[PDB]
Amino acid sequence: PKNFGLDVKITGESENDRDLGTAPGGTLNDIGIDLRPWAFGQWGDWSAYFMGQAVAATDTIETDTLQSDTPDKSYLAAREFWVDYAGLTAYPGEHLRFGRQRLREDSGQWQDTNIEALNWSFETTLLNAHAGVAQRFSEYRTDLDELAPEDKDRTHVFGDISTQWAPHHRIGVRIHHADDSGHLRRPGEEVDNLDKTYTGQLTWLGIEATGDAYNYRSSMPLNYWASATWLTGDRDNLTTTTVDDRRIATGKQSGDVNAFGVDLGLRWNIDEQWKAGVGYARGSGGGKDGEEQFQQTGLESNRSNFTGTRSRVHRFGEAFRGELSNLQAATLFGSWQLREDYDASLVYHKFWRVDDDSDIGTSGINAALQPGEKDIGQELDLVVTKYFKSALIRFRGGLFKPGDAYGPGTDSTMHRAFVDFIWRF
Ligand SMILES: CCCCCCC/C=C/CCCCCC(=O)OC[C@@H](O)CO
Ligand SMILES: CCCCCCC/C=C\CCCCCC(=O)OC[C@@H](O)CO
Ligand SMILES: CCCCCCC/C=C\CCCCCC(=O)OC[C@@H](O)CO
Ligand SMILES: CCCCCCC/C=C\CCCCCC(=O)OC[C@@H](O)CO
Ligand SMILES: CCCCCCC/C=C\CCCCCC(=O)OC[C@H](O)CO
Ligand SMILES: CCCCCCCCCCCC[N+](C)(C)[O-]
Ligand SMILES: CCCCCCCCCCCC[N+](C)(C)[O-]
Ligand SMILES: CCCCCCCCCCCC[N+](C)(C)[O-]
Ligand SMILES: CCCCCCCCCCCC[N+](C)(C)[O-]
Ligand SMILES: CCCCCCCCCCCC[N+](C)(C)[O-]
Ligand SMILES: [Ca+2]
């Protein structure tokens, strides 16, 4: 029985320009402290949990590798607050959770965030199923009084069902729906940064096959992941006049969304220390008003253990932070690990634009794209970790080289590096 605990973290973030010299800001070389006290109790079928956050930094630096963690120098936050009930069935892996909680999916491409949700979890040796509802109402932070433009009035409903057909081999289907209840800006009106750009309903229907894809300790000399997703729905996009400094609303446009996302990967377990492999991912692009343009839920971190280590790496570069939106990416990787002691991960990515006249999903780059050019760029990552006997010291960095899609006047190279010192009580 463990009731209280505290997580002390010391983050060192260094990021360079983001907009690659096209706008003011995006540069960081700052240090910060993160104290996360957590409470927990359990009474029969019931259990309750709370986690707070206290952050004091030299600037607005990132303190965790989550979607809710993508403002003033210091802030207090209500990280997690939930009540759980495991008395619905006689199943040990079955439980219903209500409140702000972490929604986790192993690929991190669907859900990996702390959000207000009612999530029903069912886990057995043979079958795993999860069904829930989620919506953002507040950031529960002292420095933020307004939600993200995309999170405001966005209601989610998700379902997972997967079976272990062969030992270490899982096949499953996934469903997600995001409904936008928002209000768009009127022609003469002003459109802000925290102001909405789109409305409409989007349904995701995916199929995923795994053979110890995110399991660092496997008997199998080869590991794989294969995921195919079909995005269907409609959208109400606010057109703008970006040329004027204020960027006024003007009109809007409608278009049905019919897109598709694919993600393949192969890992080679050379021995119990050395691992390597290839990855490929494509998010459909083009069509009128982004008709064939794929997009993700908005609850994704795109972080996983695809490299074959305890450490979680960003699937589409730590610096570029790729999203499967009009994006095609080739991936090479290599990892090393000693005992429960150390681990390293070296990853290389080459990015492409599916449609040369439309935008790409980038969670780390804020630069305009050159029309008619598909070469986004190439990235190299390094994740190094030492574990303490229970903290860890970790370097997590990416080095992005902007290609032909980012015209002259943009930086030759950009980075995003982190040094994290955690100590859990
Ligand atoms: C273009 C689509 C063609 C449809 C065929 C799909 C075939 C996909 C194969 C994926 C790699 C092989 C997986 C092998 C595997 O799961 O091991 C079976 C083993 O565990 C049984 O004991
Ligand atoms: C939307 C639901 C939110 C629920 C709030 C989360 C609950 C807050 C803290 C979790 C720890 C349980 C606190 C209850 C308590 O103090 O009972 C005493 C007992 O735990 C002694 O250890
Ligand atoms: C006791 C366990 C609670 C589960 C209750 C069952 C909830 C109903 C359906 C579960 C499917 C997952 C939800 C996803 C969904 O249906 O939305 C997609 C739908 O809008 C397609 O247009
Ligand atoms: C063997 C190479 C492994 C790759 C290491 C990845 C580390 C990523 C970024 C390092 C940040 C420190 C700045 C280093 C530097 O001087 O880069 C110059 C220029 O590219 C700035 O973006
Ligand atoms: C910015 C700090 C983040 C980096 C973590 C520090 C890890 C340092 C070196 C990793 C390379 C592995 C060498 C250590 C090793 O395995 O041999 C020594 C002993 O076996 C363990 O003490
Ligand atoms: C390699 C990644 C490590 C990031 C580097 C962190 C440097 C600490 C910056 C503190 C100095 C900033 N200042 C002047 C505002 O205090
Ligand atoms: C060197 C700083 C001391 C480390 C302690 C970190 C906790 C900082 C709490 C900040 C909360 C204040 N705030 C933002 C609500 O006004
Ligand atoms: C360490 C946890 C401390 C408790 C939670 C503090 C967060 C309060 C959120 C309300 C902040 C007020 N505001 C400015 C957003 O309106
Ligand atoms: C990518 C390989 C495709 C394999 C398809 C799965 C066939 C296994 C037969 C289903 C039986 C499932 N089970 C274990 C619940 O009985
Ligand atoms: C990034 C490319 C993928 C790495 C491929 C892994 C290399 C295969 C292992 C060759 C080792 C030879 N051996 C021991 C089997 O004889
Ligand atoms: Ca800049």
Q: Which residue has the tokens 């209280």?
A: 4
Neighbours of 33 (CB within 10 A): 15
Residues contacting 145, CB < 8 A, separation 6+ = none
Residue 300 sits at the vertex; the CA angle it makes with 12 and 26, to the nearest 5 degrees, is: 40
Cα separation, 225 vs 306, in Å, equals 9
Q: Which residue has the tokens 């598909």?
A: 374
Nearest ligand 2 atom to the CA of 100 is: 1
Which ligand lies nearest to the CA atom of residue 119 in the structure? 3
* Residue type for position 304: S
Technique employed here was X-ray
Identify the residues whose C-beta falls under 6 Å from ligand 8: 52-54, 76, 78, 140, 142, 144-145
List residues, by chain if needed, whose CB lies under 5 Å from ion ligand 11: 17, 19, 26
Cα separation, 247 vs 378, in Å, equals 32
Burial class (CB in 10 A: 0-12, 13-18, 19+), 224: middle
CA of residue 388 relative to chain centroid, distance: 27
CA of residue 185 relative to chain centroid, distance: 28
Considering only CA atoms, which of 349, 423, 421 is closest in space to residue 382? 349
Nearest ligand 1 atom to the CA of 224 is: 11
Residues contacting 397, CB < 8 A, separation 6+ = 318, 319, 381, 382, 383, 415, 416, 417, 418
Going by alpha carbons, the residue nearest to atom 1 of ligand 10 is: 277
Q: Look at phi and psi of residue 238 and say left if phi exceeds 0, alpha if psi is from -120 to 50, else beta.
A: beta
The two tokens of residue 159 are 């379902």
Burial class (CB in 10 A: 0-12, 13-18, 19+), 53: buried
Cα separation, 254 vs 402, in Å, equals 32
CA of 166 to the centre of ligand 9 (A): 7
Nearest ligand 9 atom to the CA of 163 is: 15
Cα separation, 130 vs 124, in Å, equals 12
The experimental resolution of this structure, in angstroms, equals: 2.9
From residue 123, how far is each of 25, 93, 131, 222, 236 by CA, in Å? 46, 5, 12, 25, 38
Cα separation, 163 vs 179, in Å, equals 29
Burial class (CB in 10 A: 0-12, 13-18, 19+), 62: middle
Three-state SS string over the chain comes to CCCEEEEEEEEEEEECCCCCCCCCCCCEEEEEEEEEEEEEEEECCEEEEEEEEEEEECCCCCCCCCHHHCCCCEEEEEEEEEEEECCCCCCCCCEEEEEEEEEECCCCCCCEEEEEEEEEEEECCCEEEEEEEEECCCCCECCCCCCCCCCCCEEEEEEEEEEEEECCEEEEEEEEEEEECCCCCCCCCECCCCCCCEEEEEEEEEEEEEECCCCCCCCCCEEEEEEEEEEEEEEEEECCCCCCCCCECCCEEEEEEEEEEEEEEEEECCCCCCEEEEEEEEECCCCCCCCCCCCCCCCCCCEECCCCCCCCEECCCCCCCECCCCEEEEEEEEEEEECCCEEEEEEEEEEEECCCCCCCCECCCCCCCCCCCCEEEEEEEEEEEEECCCCEEEEEEEEEEECCCCCECECCCEEEEEEEEEEEC
- Regarding the beta carbon of 118 and ligand 3, being less than 6 Å apart is answered no
Cα separation, 304 vs 420, in Å, equals 18
Considering only CA atoms, which of 120, 194, 187 is closest in space to residue 153? 194
Which ligand lies nearest to the CA atom of residue 81 in the structure? 2
Residues, the chain, total? 425
Which ligand lies nearest to the CA atom of residue 33 in the structure? 7
Cα separation, 406 vs 204, in Å, equals 31
Identify the residues whose C-beta falls under 6 Å from ligand 4: 14, 16, 380, 382, 397-399, 413-415, 417
The two tokens of residue 164 are 């272990």
The two tokens of residue 118 are 């009612």
Mutate to test the pocket of ligand 2, among 38, 43, 83, 135 (most ligand atoms within 8 A of CB): 83
Cα separation, 229 vs 303, in Å, equals 18
Q: Look at phi and psi of residue 212 and say left if phi exceeds 0, alpha if psi is from -120 to 50, else beta.
A: left
CA of 279 to the centre of ligand 9 (A): 24
Q: Which phi and psi (to 5°) does residue 67 adopt?
A: -65, -40
For residue 348, the cross-strand partners are 332, 380
Neighbours of 20 (CB within 10 A): 22
Cα separation, 209 vs 173, in Å, equals 9
Considering only CA atoms, which of 229, 227, 292 is closest in space to residue 265? 227
For residue 388, the cross-strand partners are none
Q: Which residue has the tokens 């989620």?
A: 134
| 8 A C-beta contact, residue 420 and residue 393 | yes
Nearest ligand 4 atom to the CA of 318 is: 8
| 8 A C-beta contact, residue 370 and residue 406 | yes
Cα separation, 280 vs 349, in Å, equals 9
| 8 A C-beta contact, residue 114 and residue 66 | yes
Considering only CA atoms, which of 96, 94, 132, 93 is closest in space to residue 115? 132
For residue 266, the cross-strand partners are 224, 278
Q: Which residue has the tokens 């294969």?
A: 226
Architecture of domain 1-425: Beta Barrel (2.40)
Nearest ligand 6 atom to the CA of 14 is: 4
Cα separation, 244 vs 13, in Å, equals 34
What are the boundaries of each domain within the chain? 1-425
Cα separation, 396 vs 167, in Å, equals 33
Residues contacting 127, CB < 8 A, separation 6+ = 161, 162, 163, 164
| 8 A C-beta contact, residue 79 and residue 27 | no
- Regarding the beta carbon of 222 and ligand 10, being less than 6 Å apart is answered no
Considering only CA atoms, which of 81, 82, 79 is closest in space to residue 35? 79
Which ligand lies nearest to the CA atom of residue 25 in the structure? 11
The two tokens of residue 244 are 């004027």
Neighbours of 383 (CB within 10 A): 23
The two tokens of residue 404 are 């032909």
The two tokens of residue 189 are 């009106």
Mutate to test the pocket of ligand 4, among 399, 406, 419 (most ligand atoms within 8 A of CB): 399
Mutate to test the pocket of ligand 10, among 223, 264, 267, 268 (most ligand atoms within 8 A of CB): 268
Cα separation, 132 vs 117, in Å, equals 7
Burial class (CB in 10 A: 0-12, 13-18, 19+), 103: buried
Cα separation, 59 vs 31, in Å, equals 8
| 8 A C-beta contact, residue 328 and residue 403 | no
Q: Which residue has the tokens 């995006």?
A: 26
Which ligand lies nearest to the CA atom of residue 53 in the structure? 8
Q: Which phi and psi (to 5°) does residue 69 adopt?
A: -120, 45
Cα separation, 21 vs 40, in Å, equals 47
- Regarding the beta carbon of 131 and ligand 3, being less than 6 Å apart is answered yes
